[PDB]
Ligand binder design. Structure first.
Ligand SMILES: CC(=O)N[C@H]1[C@H](O[C@H]2[C@H](O[C@H](C)C(=O)N[C@@H](C)C(=O)N[C@H](CCC(=O)N[C@@H](CCC[C@@H](N)C(=O)O)C(=O)N[C@H](C)C(=O)O)C(=O)O)[C@@H](NC(C)=O)[C@@H]3OC[C@H]2O3)O[C@H](CO)[C@@H](O)[C@@H]1O
Length: 170
């Protein structure tokens, strides 16, 4: 958990209104992407995250950056709203999941191996610390709402991960 880059490291602004507590442990984990450029340099990812918080607060009218966590192609996990806060990333699932978004656009390409592995470590970390249910269901954004997110190629990768839940075939 110390490997997680905190909000203060990307100069986050404090939420406009009191955030909503998320009832833990979460039953679902949604994987998304930002549909932005990707970068292997921490300085660039930090720029993207801070500009995204503004996009979400000022361009979208939301309370804070939408995701609970972000994964950069530099292999880092960045704190979004965190482990205990209801996100604004997946309509119909915000109150019962953690939203993890990969920084980039993965319609054809895949995030770096390190980014993919750190994301898996983040999931194990959450289960191990009790934030994520032991029998949690891992799902993708596109399975919940009409959207390319987290990108076709990344979606194909995720469905090969343990805990992947096929909402349609069930
Ligand atoms: C390549 C691609 O992914 N394109 C998609 C495109 O991707 C967008 C892209 O979207 C990415 C994939 C993304 O992460 N989108 C999420 C945040 C999104 O828009 N999610 C909404 C739900 C948002 C949400 O939960 N909002 C809360 C906001 C609540 C406000 C306040 N209470 C707060 O807590 O902040 C809400 O309404 N919650 C209520 C109360 C509830 O859950 O009951 C959804 O499921 O479609 C945006 N990038 C960023 C960083 O925001 C950007 O703007 C357009 C494009 O680039 O989205 C459109 C749909 O809008 C899709 O059709 C496209 O296929």
């Amino acid at each position: 958990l110390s490997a997680i880059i905190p909000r203060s490291s990307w100069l986050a602004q404090k939420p406009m209104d009191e955030p909503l507590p998320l009832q833990l442990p979460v039953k679902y984990v949604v994987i998304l992407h930002t549909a932005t450029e990707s970068s292997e340099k921490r300085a660039i990812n930090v720029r993207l995250i801070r500009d995204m918080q503004s996009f979400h607060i000022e361009s979208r009218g939301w309370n804070d950056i939408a995701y609970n966590f972000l994964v950069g192609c530099d292999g880092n996990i960045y704190e979004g709203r965190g482990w205990k806060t209801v996100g604004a990333h997946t309509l119909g699932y915000n109150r019962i999941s953690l939203g993890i978004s990969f920084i980039g656009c993965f319609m054809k390409e895949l995030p770096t191996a390190d980014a993919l592995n750190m994301c898996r470590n983040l999931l194990a970390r959450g289960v191990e610390d009790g934030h994520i249910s032991t029998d949690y269901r891992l799902i993708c954004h596109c399975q919940c709402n009409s959207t390319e997110s987290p990108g076709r190629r990344l979606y194909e990768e995720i469905q090969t991960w343990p805990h992947f839940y096929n909402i349609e075939e069930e």
